[PDB]
Amino acid sequence: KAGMTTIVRDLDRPGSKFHKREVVEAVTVVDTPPVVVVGVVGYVETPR
């Protein structure tokens, strides 16, 4: 996680009062590089 910001977008929720209107919403930004795979692990079913 990094932090938050504020945006604007036109709506497509039809029949609402704010259809074809714009709004303001708050979003979180999360920094998200590439992970790298190093392994694989195998799980199997048991009665436990």
Binding site: E45, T46, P47, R48
Partner: protein, 197 residues
Amino acid sequence: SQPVVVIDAKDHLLGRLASTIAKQVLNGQKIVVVRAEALNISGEFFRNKLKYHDFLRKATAFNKTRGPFHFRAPSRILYKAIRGMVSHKTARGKAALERLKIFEGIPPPYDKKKRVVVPQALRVLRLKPGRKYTTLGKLSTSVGWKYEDVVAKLEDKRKVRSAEYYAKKRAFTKKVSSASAAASESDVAKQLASFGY
């Protein structure tokens, strides 16, 4: 008489097993009970369900982690019935209940080892034909078990891996009977037949 006993629990009744187990294990015999999801119990399903839902009701109010631990697995329902029959609060009940090893399905070690049956608890012999009986897997699942669909996927592999063994053995011994039946017409056997062998 054998050092360890392996009890197939199919078509058995719970409280009529556990009074044999709880005495044979208090007298010094090691017992394992296997295929406990195939156990049977008197009474209709709804009735034996309510007799569990009136157990889940009983938990220590001020903190329920202190109270009656309602186990949902058949291996543990049977153990409950036995723990009740045993003075588990002493070093004799404790020592006994460590002579016991209960399972669902038949794991490998007790797969290739012979199984037995307690006739004074078989539903077949005991119960009237026409009475309703309830199966512990359906019950456990209905009160919050999870691993029913696994045991059936494993025990079937057990069965198809066992049926081939049985066919192998049978198609071996049908000739042992022939080559010992071809050898029973001598004096060695006409003399034993008088002794009773």
